[PDB]
Design a protein around this ligand. Structure first.
Ligand SMILES: Cc1c(O)nc(CC(=O)O)c(C)c1OP(=O)(O)OC[C@H]1O[C@@H](n2cnc3c(=O)[nH]c(N)nc32)[C@H](O)[C@@H]1O
Ligand SMILES: Cc1c(O)nc(CC(=O)O)c(C)c1OP(=O)(O)OC[C@H]1O[C@@H](n2cnc3c(=O)[nH]c(N)nc32)[C@H](O)[C@@H]1O
Ligand SMILES: Cc1c(O)nc(CC(=O)O)c(C)c1OP(=O)(O)OC[C@H]1O[C@@H](n2cnc3c(=O)[nH]c(N)nc32)[C@H](O)[C@@H]1O
Ligand SMILES: Cc1c(O)nc(CC(=O)O)c(C)c1OP(=O)(O)OC[C@H]1O[C@@H](n2cnc3c(=O)[nH]c(N)nc32)[C@H](O)[C@@H]1O
Lengths: 158, 158, 158, 157
């Protein structure tokens, strides 16, 4: 069953007041989309971030993985910058999966890393506390963020 | 300074490539908006979810706290249901803060609790894994979500 | 060239501040997307709305055109109901093009017809005044809306 | 009523499947928000665009009307740049209304002018064809878009 047919079913359940939350078939399709991704685009031009992401993703799938040629810092003027960055990458590059990391919402709100599919659907995300608070190396932070975004949909890096 | 003037500064930084993450003034402003709120709307008609949220928020601020008299489950046909739920409350109720909890993304993607201000800005949020995995009492889940959403922007419940 | 490449050039212009509005290549690519579409989904379960749009779209392309099995009225709790209806159709059906027609914005704001591409991108659109004013048959309104949305990107129905 | 209550009424009609389009009260309320605005922000730092919009809006209301100090062209990397410009101005300026004009959607998709209220709700909008086609002066174009955006919610200059 294709993702669209799985989502159709969820939407019908919601409309008709029988939706009881996420279902096993749905989680499985999510996992499948990530693990089976053949091409992955990371919505950054910052080589530091890219390498942390790429190395982890290589433990889970057999995709070609690349970053962007433009600076996505301008997403930082939007309401939800991490998400904006993911849709910028979706507009300019064809891929199976898009991974973005940046600010969650307003200045002050900490960070969000998000994984989108090829139509811009939010498959998974994870957040860190504002760097003003945690003060960890950005490298260690992104690593923890990616790993938690995967574990929360049943994907272990082993 | 006013929130709008704080955000203008952040935006100027990003436009001109000198933005080095969240700043103290920015964190402080968010905490202030939450701690000083006079009216809070919880973006549900579900009594159980409301009570859990309210009892916590009364530990941190002195607001009148109320829930909605419409079912926001129809948000579940949109891309980011939890955010959609916040913006429905924003459209139909006047408050200083809006709290919503729902599915993060596509079916299977787990949960998001989000706090929005007076103009729909994302102030903070937290996520839980797909209920398919964690399998916890929802009321215990929402407690953990709200406390982490507060703690990641410097607000302690104790 | 591929749409992604075209958009990348535009974004590059914008970043550098040499963007002087839409380009012939961009118009040509939009036209191509529409005229060459093989499958079109109308984001509605309303047979009247469907028939109007179908018969017009058949004058411009050789697609299979269908509607949905679910009522996309629930998009009418969101900020931008017409756009929300398009993104619901995108989530539940595969197609080259999605056409949605509903309320522009807040209650009282009149109507929007919008055409999206297979990744959710906005190709063209058109509006009618609020029905409280114009008082015309819905089918006559949708016909005029569609024909406008097509002529403003250089597509003639004649 | 307050706008929030008029909106709840409308949403309730929708949930129950009895919504039969816009209503006179909702249209009145939109007109009211526009004509009675005391402050308006034009979401641009472009003087020519600002001036065309200001001179028209001064015929409809008695507001203070101002533009931004930042270039909102960075909106042009998002899916719907005109709307994004609106919500940038909302984030950095208090006002009763916000007016933005820029590209509707994808490169090549033509223009949109939009008017948002103080919570970012979409009150009205208007579109022009791709400039590649109409080939008009941008100032004539914006005059026509604002006028149509006002006239479609019952506001005559
Ligand atoms: C509608 C919906 C959905 O499809 N998926 C999720 C993700 C997930 O299941 O983790 C959520 C949170 C959701 O939204 P909502 O907060 O409205 O949850 C709807 C229903 O889905 C089940 N559910 C949601 N979150 C939890 C949870 O944390 N624990 C348990 N036991 N059930 C849950 C409950 O029956 C609940 O009434
Ligand atoms: C632009 C931006 C922002 O204003 N705030 C935040 C939230 C926060 O500061 O916690 C983020 C994540 C952000 O986006 P981006 O991922 O582009 O990070 C921007 C810059 O802000 C700093 N920064 C962001 N996240 C971290 C972190 O986890 N650790 C450290 N040390 N610095 C960080 C770095 O200078 C980094 O290059
Ligand atoms: C950045 C941008 C774009 O890529 N496409 C469009 C649609 C279109 O070209 O029809 C617009 C409106 C736009 O946004 P903005 O209002 O910021 O226009 C950017 C530049 O694009 C040109 N332009 C935009 N609207 C018009 C117009 O109505 N007439 C003419 N001659 N040029 C125009 C001008 O050079 C202008 O400085
Ligand atoms: C839900 C909704 C709404 O509240 N307002 C508007 C703006 C407006 O009233 O002008 C629209 C377009 C709408 O969405 P939708 O296309 O789903 O219409 C819902 C119903 O609202 C009435 N309606 C909408 N557009 C027209 C129109 O162009 N002509 C007429 N006569 N009725 C209309 C019809 O009863 C229709 O069944």
């Amino acid at each position: 069953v294709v993702m669209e047919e799985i989502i159709k079913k969820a939407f019908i359940e919601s409309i008709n007041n029988i939706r009881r939350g996420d279902k096993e078939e749905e989680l499985k399709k999510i996992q499948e989309k990530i693990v089976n991704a053949k091409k992955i685009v990371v919505a950054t031009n910052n080589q530091k971030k890219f390498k942390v992401i790429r190395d982890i993703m290589l433990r889970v799938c057999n995709a070609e993985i690349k970053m962007l040629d433009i600076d996505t810092r301008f997403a930082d003027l939007t309401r939800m910058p991490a998400l904006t960055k993911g849709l910028i990458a979706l507009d300019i590059e064809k891929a199976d999966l898009y991974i973005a990391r940046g600010r969650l919402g307003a200045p002050g709100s900490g960070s969000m890393l998000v994984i989108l599919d090829e139509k811009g659907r939010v498959l998974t995300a994870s957040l860190s506390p504002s760097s003003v608070i945690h003060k960890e190396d950005i490298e260690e932070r992104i690593k923890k963020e990616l790993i938690e975004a995967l574990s929360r949909i049943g994907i272990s890096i082993l």
